Amino acid sequence: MVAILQLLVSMLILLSFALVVSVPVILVSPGEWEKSKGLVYTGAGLWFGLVIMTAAFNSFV
Amino acid sequence: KLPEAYAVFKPIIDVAPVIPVFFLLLAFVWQAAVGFR
């Protein structure tokens, strides 16, 4: 029950790092945000879902 | 100490408080790359 939470929050850290690196780059770059606008939405939604899941699995630990 | 599950991520928690300083430095880096225009 603890290893699952640790893996989940490690995935959350990795996704937060990826979003921090990508989102300003995607938005500022004139080439991006047209062919890859939905990628930002999917990444942010996955980030919030990971946050909710970590909050859930914290209760059982 | 941190709750035991989260105790593994301590090395991130031990560097996170100083991040805003880097932000200031990052701003200077941007002014360096832009050529202090």
Partner: peptide
């Protein structure tokens, strides 16, 4: 070692955005 690696990754994440913007020649 973990502290140093995390610090290095965080310190890389900042200028990495600027480098990627310069490569894509965006509004820097």
């Amino acid at each position: 070692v973990a502290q140093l690696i995390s610090l290095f990754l965080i310190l890389t994440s900042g200028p990495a955005i600027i480098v990627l913007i310069a490569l894509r020649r965006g509004n820097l």
